[PDB]
Design a binder for this molecule. Structure first.
Ligand SMILES: NC(=O)c1ccc[n+]([C@@H]2O[C@H](COP(=O)([O-])OP(=O)(O)OC[C@H]3O[C@@H](n4cnc5c(N)ncnc54)[C@H](O)[C@@H]3O)[C@@H](O)[C@H]2O)c1
Ligand SMILES: NC(=O)c1ccc[n+]([C@@H]2O[C@H](COP(=O)([O-])OP(=O)(O)OC[C@H]3O[C@@H](n4cnc5c(N)ncnc54)[C@H](O)[C@@H]3O)[C@@H](O)[C@H]2O)c1
Ligand SMILES: O=c1ccn([C@@H]2O[C@H](COP(=O)(O)OP(=O)(O)O[C@H]3O[C@H](CO)[C@@H](O)[C@H](O)[C@H]3O)[C@@H](O)[C@H]2O)c(=O)[nH]1
Ligand SMILES: O=c1ccn([C@@H]2O[C@H](COP(=O)(O)OP(=O)(O)O[C@H]3O[C@H](CO)[C@@H](O)[C@H](O)[C@H]3O)[C@@H](O)[C@H]2O)c(=O)[nH]1
Lengths: 336, 344
């Protein structure tokens, strides 16, 4: 069984490719290497051992229709997992056309080529950013949707495109996965991430930054700092194995489904700092600051739908995430 | 010399706007792929424009053809772009959503990128009152909540949001989004007008085909709404008034650029008219009788929608000059002189 993984050289994608190879899939990755190194997939192939030969890599942009058509014509794909996209919020505010072009034109082209080739099974990387600034927690998949920056708008637009495609053509089977806050690295520390709290904390721990600025101390949370659902990247990867299994075993009873991928636990900024201090043995000097414009106060997942319908629950906790980030970053201070 | 690039200018609203522009002395470059129009509308525009027809140049190009679009922008100095190009059939958008997302979003994104790279950051965009969805009150002001109820409507709202994000990223952009209400009618000469393919999806093109004998009756979709007669109520605006609202938008960009960023204005009349009232007005204009069939509501239809005109009146200095009687007169003149459209 062969899976096309767009964006598979990136953070979540590379961890997912490793698990797919262990599960016995043939994997074809398409990635333009805009935001990733080819070394990530070389290392994934090493970690895959006996299954490393089942990984094929093509340096292709999804907007290159001809190149994409040739990839689909050379393989019979069971499904596509679509991680490719740009994701930096600040860059999206400064360069919105870059984001709308890359994310929307790349996705639309992929969907068209998929339909023309008869591959109508998709798993899409969405994000909890589509819940906006939620009025209540935990956030269920039925919550009101609204994006708060151009990057988030691209994710919500793509979800809506997928729902419209499914309504137009019931042969499509689509799973949208709303990831919460990814942290960590494979526990080998040989692959990992190469703009967010925990990467900043780790840089403070090694002295590359003098302090962590804490954005907001007057929130209505236990310690006054912002609260998020931090989820180990290996758990996120595993949720994609569950999504392929759902498409493989339960396609007759799904259409365009959406599931949160989170832990269901909210952890504050200071709690994550404390967990990282314990993992690293380092102190993280703090500067307390005002709220950061655009920040939600508290966001975490309602896990019930994923637990019952996707048959998936996260397995790793925040201390483990912090240890695995520390291990990767200590062994690889400059990434790959 | 002032030159305007008009995308989608071979279509219904675009052709009427091209004509008004030519009559004001603008040079007009039209980009249109002719997917939903023929050259005939533009050739009649050029005929009505007299010697000013020499000031209309037509480029048969798709907005997604980046190389061809770059060639146009690099060889012209444009004061502004008016962007009418797009697909607009609701039912087709539900059945073929990728066609709509591709044409409308990829075309618009390509256009904005080519504009920005070639130093033309002045845009007037064809939006729609569809973004108000099912309004909780009327009249609808520009600050009402925005939604989309079908894939076509989603493309319009997404493009409005792209434009707002582009402006926020780069204050040299000046963008006017125009939310059209329900366009009806034709230039009073009767030489140009709406020429739909197939069975018309909208009320007044359907009515006129009944009046000229090509279809046997109008089906009325829904008679149980909470309105005066039970049928849907809309703000019908003469297409020539819509065209004049674009002249007003260009004037605002030309004279008031500093005070604006990415602004939005309704283009409507502020009056709601029901389906039955439009049929009666068309019977009076045409002298024909329109037989009716009664049916249930059409999925997705709003009950009552009409414009709050105060912002356009104050800030664009624009108000509609035509009423329902004139819209119906002008539609009938186009229909009876061209019962089979441009093809004859
Ligand atoms: N969070 C969301 O989840 C997904 C994965 O997140 P992540 O943390 O792994 O991000 P990431 O940046 O590590 O992974 C995204 C990958 O997609 C690739 N990519 C971007 N645009 C592409 C295009 N047009 N064609 C082909 N490849 C392209 C990038 O090079 C990168 O390797 C993203 O969609 C992100 O928005
Ligand atoms: N009249 C309405 O029902 C109505 C009301 C509100 C808003 N609008 C919007 O107003 C605009 C004009 O309306 P209209 O009645 O003149 O529609 P129309 O279909 O007559 O005009 C659209 C024109 O755009 C052209 N076009 C489409 N895709 C193109 C592309 N990629 N490149 C170049 N040209 C392309 C078509 O060939 C057509 O001539 C449209 O964008 C429409 O969505 C429609
Ligand atoms: O230097 C920092 C960075 C973050 N925070 C706080 O830490 C928490 C997490 O922040 P961050 O890592 O920026 O994540 P989010 O605010 O949840 O959102 C970012 O991270 C998400 C997960 O990767 C993405 O989906 C979003 O698009 C992206 O804006 C927030 O409460 C922040 O206020 C700080 O106090 N100091
Ligand atoms: O054969 C018909 C067609 C329409 N109607 C009724 O007539 C009214 C107007 O319908 P229509 O002409 O189809 O316009 P709307 O659906 O209001 O849509 C128009 O008004 C919106 C506001 O801009 C635009 O988005 C649309 O593209 C534009 O075509 C509605 O109450 C319809 O139920 C009928 O009874 N029979």
């Amino acid at each position: 069984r062969t899976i096309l993984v767009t964006g598979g050289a990136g953070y979540i994608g590379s961890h997912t490719v490793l698990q797919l190879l262990q599960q016995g899939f043939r994997v074809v990755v398409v990635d333009n290497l805009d935001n990733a190194s080819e070394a990530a997939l070389a290392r994934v192939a090493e970690l895959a051992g006996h299954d490393g030969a089942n990984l094929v890599f093509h340096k292709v942009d999804l907007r290159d229709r001809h190149a994409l058509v040739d990839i689909f014509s050379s393989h019979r794909f069971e499904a596509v997992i679509h991680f490719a996209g740009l994701k930096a919020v600040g860059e999206s505010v400064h360069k919105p056309l870059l984001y709308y072009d890359n994310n929307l034109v790349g996705t639309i082209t992929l969907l068209e080529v998929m339909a023309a080739n008869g591959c109508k099974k998709l798993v899409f990387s969405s994000s909890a950013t589509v819940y906006g600034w939620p009025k209540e927690v935990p956030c269920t998949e039925e919550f009101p949707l609204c994006a708060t920056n151009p990057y988030g708008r691209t994710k919500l637009v793509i979800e809506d495109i997928c729902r419209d495609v499914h309504r137009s053509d019931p042969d499509w089977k689509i799973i949208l996965l709303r990831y919460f806050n990814p942290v960590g690295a494979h526990p080998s520390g040989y692959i990992g991430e190469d703009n967010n709290l925990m990467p900043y904390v780790q840089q403070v721990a090694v002295g590359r930054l003098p302090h962590l600025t804490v954005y907001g101390t007057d929130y209505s949370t236990k310690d006054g700092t912002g609260v998020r659902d931090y989820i180990h990247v290996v758990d996120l990867a595993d949720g994609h194995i569950a999504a392929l299994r759902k498409l493989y075993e339960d396609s007759d009873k799904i259409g365009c489904e959406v599931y949160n991928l989170g832990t269901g636990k909210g952890t504050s900024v200071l709690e994550m700092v404390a967990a990282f201090e314990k993992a690293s043995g380092k102190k993280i000097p703090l500067v307390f600051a005002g709220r950061r414009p655009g920040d939600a106060e508290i966001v975490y997942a309602a896990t019930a739908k994923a637990e019952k319908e996707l048959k998936w629950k996260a397995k790793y906790g925040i201390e483990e995430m912090c240890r695995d980030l520390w291990n990767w970053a200590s062994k690889n201070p400059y990434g790959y």
